[model samples]
Target: MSKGEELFTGVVPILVELDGDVNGHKFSVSGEGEGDATYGKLTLKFICTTGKLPVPWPTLVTTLVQCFSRYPDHMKRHDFFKSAMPEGYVQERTIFFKDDGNYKTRAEVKFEGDTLVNRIELKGIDFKEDGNILGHKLEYNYISHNVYITADKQKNGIKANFKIRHNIEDGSVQLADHYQQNTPIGDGPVLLPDNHYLSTQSALSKDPNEKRDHMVLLEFVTAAGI
Candidate 1:
């Protein structure tokens, strides 16, 4: 579907996670809403491990776009995959599960006529640890707004596993009168034509040192056209 249609369709869940430190954090964001020909109303609920904060849609869009591009230079610069990948480990090859001591980054963009529904995935690469070896994997899907990331690293005598999952769902919003306000879905609150749901959960982790189960729920509607 088109980005406009995707956004207007409502209820997308976005999940994120940092490294696997005891102090690391995790996040989740989900929302529901309605829309008309001119605008949409959204209501969101957030549960985080951190204090309340505003959504960084612009930054996130930019970052996700960059990550989805799979630029060679960009991928190599990150600590996640700093070392040079082994030879013959082509990312574009269908046989990506090979044991070549190298990871691969691949991107696929799908379109419905002119709409965009793309995806990116990074395969796990093995790394030597003294006399042993370990691996890591990362994947993000724009089609359903899902991200699954995990990496195994040992710290403080414990093998810290960094894992994160984020997803978004479609909503029941339809285009109607340009000047008419839309009724809320479910237990939604009254809102303007351009109003909608937006909730987020920040500062999340399984770490005992930095565990937070906090959340924030609010309304979010943008005048900007998609």
Candidate 2:
């Protein structure tokens, strides 16, 4: 099941991190409120529709499983790919914003979209002739998406509210000049209309040519009742 039954419950903001390399390309990705056993999921599948990765893809699919299994608890590692069968080996998980806990911080914005709903398939990613990651300007797409809405208004006297449409259910798409291979989504970090910002920019190696010691960190923050 995607949402595992837990005897213990509440908001536990766990930060999940990963550091590894694929074919000498240091890569990394992570999520905060995400884990195999947590409310979200992390899998080792491909983006292909046939439940199989394209021929000759990196061993990243396998390595991801390694790191994913080691977190939260080893017992729940098997739950990683159970939710979506015929995976074709694609990793799936939920992403949440950090900061802004539910307190006097009172959240006026509500997420009405799917948590792990979007299938982020950043197609057309390839390295350049000089090994610098590059592609034909057509770079990313989410199979679907939804929205986080909280229309602007005043209750506590502060700038707030948004009707942000994002993810796979409602659908989000982009075409960039070029996004290198072995990195997280390349259109830049997730910057909301509000000032809240999230990114894994610092988690990876800045030098695309750095063949070794490359790493990635994917993170997300979630409220406990998840």
Candidate 3:
């Protein structure tokens, strides 16, 4: 109200609404108020704890297998959520991090309708860093990197962010392809810009000669033979 209406009494209640989500949790607020010589305001807050959060499932599974199969004794996987893909249906060549509860840039690709969805899991960053995947660069910043799994269809493999795009040479970027069985026991090809890493050439079968039993070889097993 301008000058003349300055002494207005109780006016009709004015309402205000607020809605948003944070760290994967959703919340909203409703506010209503009336003005007199003294005005009182009431704000109602609502919280949503359950919501269908988007996960880099393809990557989650991929890295889960990679982490467990490779370091079963170390990386302890406790709770899990399934309903996305059937057990044993993983296509490793089209798979997807780190250690000690560390699920770094590990990723995976699987059908998210008919096409494979993709995303890279990231660790905390001191500064905003960039990520990379099939034919694209993943821009990164913030803490939600843990929950914010992005995606793409019609492609496969794990993804990463090497910080700077780099003036480095080719074949220098190497990722362990140990999860997918039968992947060659060595580097397959150059995995840098314009290309990504996946299963290596040859069958998904392992070489009996190259096999090393984790338990038998270690002192954990009471085997007399070394």
Candidate 4:
């Protein structure tokens, strides 16, 4: 048997229509049981929850793998939508800090068979000593760098951001009514642009309500006994 043969045993082959898309592109994934390959059909389920694996990072990995796999020669493959991961894990690493005193948080994600290596280096700022203000735009610099790693594929990078200028005095800071600017992808070489701005965004949209959904949050698991 092959590496995936056992796990995929008695699995079904079905078309998987990702959550969001500007042109509606669908991908195929091995199902839990033998099935047909029907693309663009609503019957196809990308992530199966009833299976033993519990469809790790169903929504997150689905879109991440989709984009990272098709990031080359295509500009309309940016928009990605996914449901909250059920019992999905998250790992974080601090990248940098600004002079203003606000800190940053960088995170690496492992969902399903793919890994979403992303970082929200700066979300907002905290200026308590200066003026006891706590807000997003007025606190610190902003930078977002996200990388996605799929099975037997190269890692892709996603970096973009906008400036923030708010002065909140520790109250619950709310997001602005609209975005000032948002460059989703970077513009690196076919694999260069190690610095920033390697890819560009053609069409991208996100659901704010989805962000408020409840998440189970997975725990980190290792193959090694140690």
C-alpha lDDT score of every prediction, in listed order: 0.22, 0.23, 0.21, 0.23
| Counted clashes in each candidate structure | 24, 30, 5, 24
Model 1's TM-score against the true structure: 0.20
**TM-score for all predictions?**
0.20, 0.22, 0.17, 0.23
Deviation of model 3 at 57, angstroms: 23
Q: What would the per-residue lDDT of candidate 1 be over residues 45-66, giving only the tens digit for each residue?
A: 2233244312222112211211
Candidate 2 per-residue lDDT, tens place, 60-113, comes to 221222112221332332222222222212232221111110101111111112
Q: How close is candidate 3 to the true structure, as a TM-score?
A: 0.17
* Residue-level lDDT for 130 in candidate 4: 35
**Cα-based RMSD of candidate 4:** 16.6
Score candidate 4 by TM-score against the native.
Answer: 0.23
- Per-residue CA lDDT of candidate 3, range 148-217, in tens? 1111112222232221111112323312122222111122221111222211111112234532211000
Which whole-number lDDT from 0 to 100 does residue 193 have in model 2? 22
State residue 9's C-alpha deviation in candidate 2, in Å.
4.2
